[PDB]
Design a protein around this nucleic acid. Sequence first.
RNA 1: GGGACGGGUGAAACAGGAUGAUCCCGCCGAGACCGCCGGCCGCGCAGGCGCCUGCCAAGACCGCCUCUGUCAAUCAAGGGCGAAGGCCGGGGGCUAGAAGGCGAUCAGACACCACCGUAUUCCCGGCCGUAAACGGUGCCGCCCCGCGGCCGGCGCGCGUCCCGCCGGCCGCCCAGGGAAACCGGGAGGCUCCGGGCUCUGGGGGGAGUAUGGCCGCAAGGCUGAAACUUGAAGGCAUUG
Lengths: 97, 126, 218, 79, 24, 55
Amino acid sequence: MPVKRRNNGRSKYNCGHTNIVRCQNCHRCVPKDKVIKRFTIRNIVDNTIADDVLNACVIQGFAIPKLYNKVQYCVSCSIHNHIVRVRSREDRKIRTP
Amino acid sequence: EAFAVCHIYAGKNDTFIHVTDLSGRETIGRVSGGMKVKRHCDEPSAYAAMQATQDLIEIITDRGITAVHIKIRADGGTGKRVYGQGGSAAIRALVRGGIKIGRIEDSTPIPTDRTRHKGGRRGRRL
Amino acid sequence: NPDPYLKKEWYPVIAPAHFKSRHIGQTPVTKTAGLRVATDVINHRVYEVNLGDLNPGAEDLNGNTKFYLQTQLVSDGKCLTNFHGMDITRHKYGSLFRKGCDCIDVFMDIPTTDGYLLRVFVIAFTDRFRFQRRKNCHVKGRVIRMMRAGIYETLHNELGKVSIPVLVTKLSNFEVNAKLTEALQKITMCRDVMIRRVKVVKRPRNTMELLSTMHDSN
Amino acid sequence: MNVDLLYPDPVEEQRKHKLKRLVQGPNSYFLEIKCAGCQDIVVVYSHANTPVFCPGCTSQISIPTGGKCAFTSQVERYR
Amino acid sequence: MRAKWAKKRMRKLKRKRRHMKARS
Amino acid sequence: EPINARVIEVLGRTSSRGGITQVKVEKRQIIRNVIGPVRKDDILVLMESEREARR
RNA sequence: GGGACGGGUGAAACAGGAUGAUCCCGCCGAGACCGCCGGCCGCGCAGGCGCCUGCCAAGACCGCCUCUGUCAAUCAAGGGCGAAGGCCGGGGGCUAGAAGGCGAUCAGACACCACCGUAUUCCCGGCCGUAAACGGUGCCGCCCCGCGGCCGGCGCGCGUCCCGCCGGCCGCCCAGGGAAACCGGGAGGCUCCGGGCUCUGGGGGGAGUAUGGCCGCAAGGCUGAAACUUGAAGGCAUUG
Ligand SMILES: [K+]
Ligand SMILES: [K+]
Ligand SMILES: [K+]
Ligand SMILES: [K+]
Ligand SMILES: [K+]
Ligand SMILES: [K+]
Ligand SMILES: [K+]
Ligand SMILES: [K+]
Ligand SMILES: [K+]
Ligand SMILES: [K+]
Ligand SMILES: [K+]
Ligand SMILES: [K+]
Ligand SMILES: [K+]
Ligand SMILES: [K+]
Ligand SMILES: [K+]
Ligand SMILES: [K+]
Ligand SMILES: [K+]
Ligand SMILES: [K+]
Ligand SMILES: [K+]
Ligand SMILES: [K+]
Ligand SMILES: [K+]
Ligand SMILES: [K+]
Ligand SMILES: [K+]
Ligand SMILES: [K+]
Ligand SMILES: [K+]
Ligand SMILES: [K+]
Ligand SMILES: [K+]
Ligand SMILES: [K+]
Ligand SMILES: [K+]
Ligand SMILES: [K+]
Ligand SMILES: [K+]
Ligand SMILES: [K+]
Ligand SMILES: [K+]
Ligand SMILES: [K+]
Ligand SMILES: [K+]
Ligand SMILES: [K+]
Ligand SMILES: [K+]
Ligand SMILES: [K+]
Ligand SMILES: [K+]
Ligand SMILES: [K+]
Ligand SMILES: [K+]
Ligand SMILES: [K+]
Ligand SMILES: [K+]
Ligand SMILES: [K+]
Ligand SMILES: [K+]
Ligand SMILES: [K+]
Ligand SMILES: [K+]
Ligand SMILES: [K+]
Ligand SMILES: [K+]
Ligand SMILES: [K+]
Ligand SMILES: [K+]
Ligand SMILES: [K+]
Ligand SMILES: [K+]
Ligand SMILES: [K+]
Ligand SMILES: [K+]
Ligand SMILES: [K+]
Ligand SMILES: [K+]
Ligand SMILES: [K+]
Ligand SMILES: [K+]
Ligand SMILES: [K+]
Ligand SMILES: [K+]
Ligand SMILES: [K+]
Ligand SMILES: [K+]
Ligand SMILES: [K+]
Ligand SMILES: [K+]
Ligand SMILES: [K+]
Ligand SMILES: [K+]
Ligand SMILES: [K+]
Ligand SMILES: [K+]
Ligand SMILES: [K+]
Ligand SMILES: [K+]
Ligand SMILES: [K+]
Ligand SMILES: [K+]
Ligand SMILES: [K+]
Ligand SMILES: [K+]
Ligand SMILES: [K+]
Ligand SMILES: [K+]
Ligand SMILES: [K+]
Ligand SMILES: [K+]
Ligand SMILES: [K+]
Ligand SMILES: [K+]
Ligand SMILES: [K+]
Ligand SMILES: [K+]
Ligand SMILES: [K+]
Ligand SMILES: [K+]
Ligand SMILES: [K+]
Ligand SMILES: [K+]
Ligand SMILES: [K+]
Ligand SMILES: [K+]
Ligand SMILES: [K+]
Ligand SMILES: [Mg+2]
Ligand SMILES: [Mg+2]
Ligand SMILES: [Mg+2]
Ligand SMILES: [Mg+2]
Ligand SMILES: [Mg+2]
Ligand SMILES: [Mg+2]
Ligand SMILES: [Mg+2]
Ligand SMILES: [Mg+2]
Ligand SMILES: [Mg+2]
Ligand SMILES: [Mg+2]
Ligand SMILES: [Mg+2]
Ligand SMILES: [Mg+2]
Ligand SMILES: [Mg+2]
Ligand SMILES: [Mg+2]
Ligand SMILES: [Mg+2]
């Protein structure tokens, strides 16, 4: 077991301790700077009915509301559900989204 | 032209479709996804929800209601925030039953700071 | 069971005179029988109504505000509603947040000149300048403190001594908003400065004169 | 190009820290200001953070600012 | 053995020895 | 009361073993799964138009 | 109000319901918690640190033609603080939940999964003194190719910007170093070996054990052998 990453697998810079979050899939405790974080904006009605709601609406000029959700998962759940992948040694250095 | 309110509870394990008046104090028709099925695992599915909504339509047309505002919620609390499978199926079975649509809104209960959810600090080890 | 809707009947609901679409709807109740009086048990129900439903036509502007009105008298087969609160929609609230900027939340207790007590919640955000090198919008503490103090003095000046009908005029007009911006623009760049909630904490038991002036235009 | 460390250019030497120059020296200086209503003239430190008054006035004419100090309604010089 | 449980076992052993030596 | 739909085009093999195919039929654009060998402009007997195929 | 199931799971079963639940809306009580914003942001000696308003004492940095005159560095003994769990005496008690109970699964399941739940979790006054208490990297001082990001203070320039300086937190990296991984703000300037100070190690086991001593209410902590046994244990890296 040598060192695998320069950040030790987290984003902790000039502090001793950080907050705890609960994984939204399995509910384990994870430090906040380690948890995998994604933000999503979606429509409350699925796009496959997004025009039939609209055509059956009495209010003139209505606009379909949206949902704003920040999903946070642990390492195990992120790998299992394919939010992140295991990468090659060269590829691990890439930070591009 | 005669507005009521539809509360759709789209949860993990079951669905509720519930119509009340504009204040919420008086109900006009209430069905669930689990009154249309035999398998416990099919209560939160789209097909049970649609067959339950089709009988809600029958109840609430005969009582004179013609339009509904929609308030759709997930489980909330400290649990899931995403809707169950039958959520949009109820809205589709409502659009294709003659009901006209007014205002839409998410009514999931979200805390401003919370108590501790079940599971322990290692999670559900499956 | 016998079908209870054989014994039901519907009453109209009417909004205060400030608005234009004065008919909210009808509501059902069981006919009077025994000791429960129909026009005693429909009193004090609360209705949430979108402002774009009460003043229709200006959808882009009025479509994210909701008014809470509760009936306080049933005269001549009609329910007469009165102001019960103000709140913005959930998707509107969620849309206001981004990463890189600052969020300011403030509340305060405001008595009115006719026996009420209100709790008012305001929210504001910082913004980029048109020519700045950085991409974050965080500001120093000498600016946060000044923004908070300016919000306090403004809501003290504008709503310091008002009546409920004047309050409802301003809340449905976004007049107060259009000046919380004005106070706060002289300090930094800020994008969404608005009253986000009005709560009623305590009221007089008797509101007959207030209800009388709110409903008949006056 | 060939710089000699023993005779540095003063212009690029003034932009360095006062202590890592070849010969350390102060950054501040004195200067003359004129009272807006009195003909006379007084000599003022450039980095003052203590009261400075007119010969006549009883209003303080300087504002301490954490660096070079500013002044209230007076017009200055350099000597 | 996992060293944590070996330590637990050793502590129980030492406490048993102290108790037995307490008599007499 | 079954209805007659008409395949508008073929989208691909769905199941883990081939088998069924996803098709666009038709004034609608309903997407459904079929077991047999479907060409273009084949007429299908639909028992309901209510259910739509996943994805 | 209304009227048949609800809960839970990968699938189920035990808990709940015609004493009307689940669901909708209004009202009330109590104790925790402080979301989105929230970060290659920031602060503190480390442990750690996030609701509103008020009060109280402090701190590093920067700026300076202010004062003193070596008043310093590192440190056995000694003093102080120190996550979580745990202990003593009071208080409180929502949530979750060691122990215990119960439904499944399984050859078995005293476990993983479901449900109920005691101590505990929170406050006050003390005790205990340990963590992968981690950057697995002691403290003070000097020199050191460069290219960037962010935070605090200051100065010059044009017309917010732009170029510098000091202090902090980060990324990449020529040389050099190294068993290599890698370091590079050092893990460089070192077999071409010497700036100052304190601590620790000397093949693997036995063993952090026995014994004695000090501390602790206890659980412990600190200090800490020998007989005997063995030819390897271990690091980083290559192919399968
Ligand atoms: K190793
Ligand atoms: K290691
Ligand atoms: K880590
Ligand atoms: K930090
Ligand atoms: K931090
Ligand atoms: K992430
Ligand atoms: K994990
Ligand atoms: K059932
Ligand atoms: K909670
Ligand atoms: K829970
Ligand atoms: K529980
Ligand atoms: K459990
Ligand atoms: K756990
Ligand atoms: K838990
Ligand atoms: K648990
Ligand atoms: K645990
Ligand atoms: K743990
Ligand atoms: K674990
Ligand atoms: K654990
Ligand atoms: K668990
Ligand atoms: K501050
Ligand atoms: K400040
Ligand atoms: K602050
Ligand atoms: K310099
Ligand atoms: K300088
Ligand atoms: K200067
Ligand atoms: K160990
Ligand atoms: K151990
Ligand atoms: K241990
Ligand atoms: K059933
Ligand atoms: K709690
Ligand atoms: K902040
Ligand atoms: K910040
Ligand atoms: K901040
Ligand atoms: K900070
Ligand atoms: K900061
Ligand atoms: K800062
Ligand atoms: K901060
Ligand atoms: K901050
Ligand atoms: K100064
Ligand atoms: K000294
Ligand atoms: K020394
Ligand atoms: K020391
Ligand atoms: K010592
Ligand atoms: K000591
Ligand atoms: K302590
Ligand atoms: K402790
Ligand atoms: K305890
Ligand atoms: K409790
Ligand atoms: K408590
Ligand atoms: K415990
Ligand atoms: K158990
Ligand atoms: K076991
Ligand atoms: K096991
Ligand atoms: K429980
Ligand atoms: K205990
Ligand atoms: K307790
Ligand atoms: K705890
Ligand atoms: K507690
Ligand atoms: K302790
Ligand atoms: K160790
Ligand atoms: K570590
Ligand atoms: K040391
Ligand atoms: K900055
Ligand atoms: K800066
Ligand atoms: K800073
Ligand atoms: K700054
Ligand atoms: K700065
Ligand atoms: K700077
Ligand atoms: K510097
Ligand atoms: K520096
Ligand atoms: K610097
Ligand atoms: K540094
Ligand atoms: K030392
Ligand atoms: K040591
Ligand atoms: K040591
Ligand atoms: K040692
Ligand atoms: K002994
Ligand atoms: K003792
Ligand atoms: K004792
Ligand atoms: K005890
Ligand atoms: K003892
Ligand atoms: K003992
Ligand atoms: K001992
Ligand atoms: K080895
Ligand atoms: K080793
Ligand atoms: K090993
Ligand atoms: K090792
Ligand atoms: K190697
Ligand atoms: K090797
Ligand atoms: Mg300087
Ligand atoms: Mg002490
Ligand atoms: Mg202590
Ligand atoms: Mg509980
Ligand atoms: Mg419990
Ligand atoms: Mg230790
Ligand atoms: Mg340690
Ligand atoms: Mg250590
Ligand atoms: Mg930084
Ligand atoms: Mg940093
Ligand atoms: Mg760095
Ligand atoms: Mg030694
Ligand atoms: Mg002993
Ligand atoms: Mg002893
Ligand atoms: Mg090798």
